[PDB]
Design a protein around this ligand. Sequence first.
Ligand SMILES: CCCCCCCC/C=C\CCCCCCCC(=O)O[C@@H](COC(=O)CCCCCCCCCCCCCCC)COP(=O)([O-])OCC[N+](C)(C)C
Ligand SMILES: CCCCCCCC/C=C\CCCCCCCC(=O)O[C@@H](COC(=O)CCCCCCCCCCCCCCC)COP(=O)([O-])OCC[N+](C)(C)C
Ligand SMILES: CC(C)CCC[C@@H](C)[C@H]1CC[C@H]2[C@@H]3CC=C4C[C@@H](O)CC[C@]4(C)[C@H]3CC[C@]12C
Ligand SMILES: CC(C)CCC[C@@H](C)[C@H]1CC[C@H]2[C@@H]3CC=C4C[C@@H](O)CC[C@]4(C)[C@H]3CC[C@]12C
Lengths: 196, 196
Amino acid sequence: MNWTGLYTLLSGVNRHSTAIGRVWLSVIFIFRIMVLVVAAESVWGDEKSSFICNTLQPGCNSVCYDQFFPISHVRLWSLQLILVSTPALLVAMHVAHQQHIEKKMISGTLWWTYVISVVFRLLFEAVFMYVFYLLYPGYAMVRLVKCDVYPCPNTVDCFVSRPTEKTVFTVFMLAASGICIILNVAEVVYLIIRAC
Amino acid sequence: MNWTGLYTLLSGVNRHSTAIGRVWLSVIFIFRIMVLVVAAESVWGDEKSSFICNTLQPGCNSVCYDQFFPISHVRLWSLQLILVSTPALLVAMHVAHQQHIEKKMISGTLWWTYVISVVFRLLFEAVFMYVFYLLYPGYAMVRLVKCDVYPCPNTVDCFVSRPTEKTVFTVFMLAASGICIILNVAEVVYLIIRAC
Ligand SMILES: CCCCCCCC/C=C\CCCCCCCC(=O)O[C@@H](COC(=O)CCCCCCCCCCCCCCC)COP(=O)([O-])OCC[N+](C)(C)C
Ligand SMILES: CCCCCCCC/C=C\CCCCCCCC(=O)O[C@@H](COC(=O)CCCCCCCCCCCCCCC)COP(=O)([O-])OCC[N+](C)(C)C
Ligand SMILES: CC(C)CCC[C@@H](C)[C@H]1CC[C@H]2[C@@H]3CC=C4C[C@@H](O)CC[C@]4(C)[C@H]3CC[C@]12C
Ligand SMILES: CC(C)CCC[C@@H](C)[C@H]1CC[C@H]2[C@@H]3CC=C4C[C@@H](O)CC[C@]4(C)[C@H]3CC[C@]12C
């Protein structure tokens, strides 16, 4: 493994991306992948097993955990990464297909599809940011929550596992997503300006 | 303690009661008291502590026990004995009061009050028999009961303590109560016949 191969793999074979989406976006993507890898198994490993409520009612822990955590942060970020990386994979596959068909026997089409893929990537980033805002208002996570879902009688106190570490990693991931959004907007603006 | 004193105490100082209510009713009353004494603490001692249901729901045992045993057989029989013995106590106290007031200074009044007390005793016996029939239809007691009272989810299986011994003692007490009813009716009929 060399740098001239890793850089080519990350950037794809596309020849229209500038240094914003070729040197900086790949680094932020690697940063997000590494943070998700080092945080998924350890911090969020025992989010449900150590989630306890102050009650004797059977089945209250599971219903309260599902009520307060419809989908954990780790899985939300994994889905966000997959959806954000899908258009880049599509562009790389399209470039490879065009190269194959021209070998066995265009610039504007590649430029347009790259612009469309960057727009879709920005849209996915914004959609996942909005979903995270809807599900979990506020970056901070609290230690104690009040759960009144059936079958729990009245309201019970349930305790979250590692609120502070999860808050730190949430801040990191949200900052990375914001940087990605800014870089995508800058890339779109730069391409439009240079094309005109 | 001699027999001529125990007999006088049981019969009271009333001079209108015949041999039915003076030799037989007192013996049946003693029999009921002895059976209740030997059965109350032992058979019904752990009726609630050993009453268990097949569920993890807290508080289901207590609500199911209260649902199926609104008032235990021992307490029902104790209340029945007290209420049945109340008119005899009233008659004895009235006889003592009349003796005291005649000493410090009638037969028809004593005859009428004795007849009324026997009628009230029969009425109390019948009322308690009907109450026992309403609360617990059938002499037999079952081992397993189906309880669907809140907070128990759906229907749970609850297990009664000593069904067979309680059935035996229920049969004994019901037979004694029936004998008491028959003797009271016979006493009333005999008094009415002899008075006319
Ligand atoms: C997302 C998770 C990240 C975790 C943190 C990772 C951080 C650290 C991880 C990785 C850092 C890199 C480690 C190896 C570097 C040596 C490369 C090398 O010598 O290449 C040379 C030889 O090599 C080859 O020909 C084969 C290259 C295999 C490299 C390892 C493959 C993946 C290992 C997966 C491991 C799985 C377990 C990992 C954990 C699950 C290049 O070939 P060459 O013939 O010299 O080139 C031509 C010669 N010429 C130039 C003179 C003309
Ligand atoms: C409902 C529960 C029932 C349970 C089953 C019971 C079955 C067995 C129970 C009881 C059977 C009787 C036992 C004692 C019998 C002896 C009587 C006697 O000798 O009398 C004589 C003396 O006696 C007295 O002067 C005093 C009498 C006291 C008797 C006991 C009082 C209550 C005990 C309560 C115990 C509490 C513990 C019990 C359990 C909680 C009579 O007096 P006298 O001077 O001879 O008379 C005149 C003389 N002359 C005739 C020559 C002219
Ligand atoms: C500018 C940034 C966003 C570019 C990022 C490039 C990403 C989307 C590309 C570069 C290399 C790609 C990987 C290359 C090889 C494989 C192995 C295959 O069996 C599953 C997909 C997987 C794991 C690809 C996933 C997408 C991937 C990680
Ligand atoms: C013909 C049958 C029904 C007659 C039965 C007589 C009954 C009702 C009488 C006879 C002796 C009585 C007892 C004599 C003395 C006492 C002690 C007193 O502190 C409480 C009441 C108590 C315990 C009496 C309760 C009623 C009693 C048991």
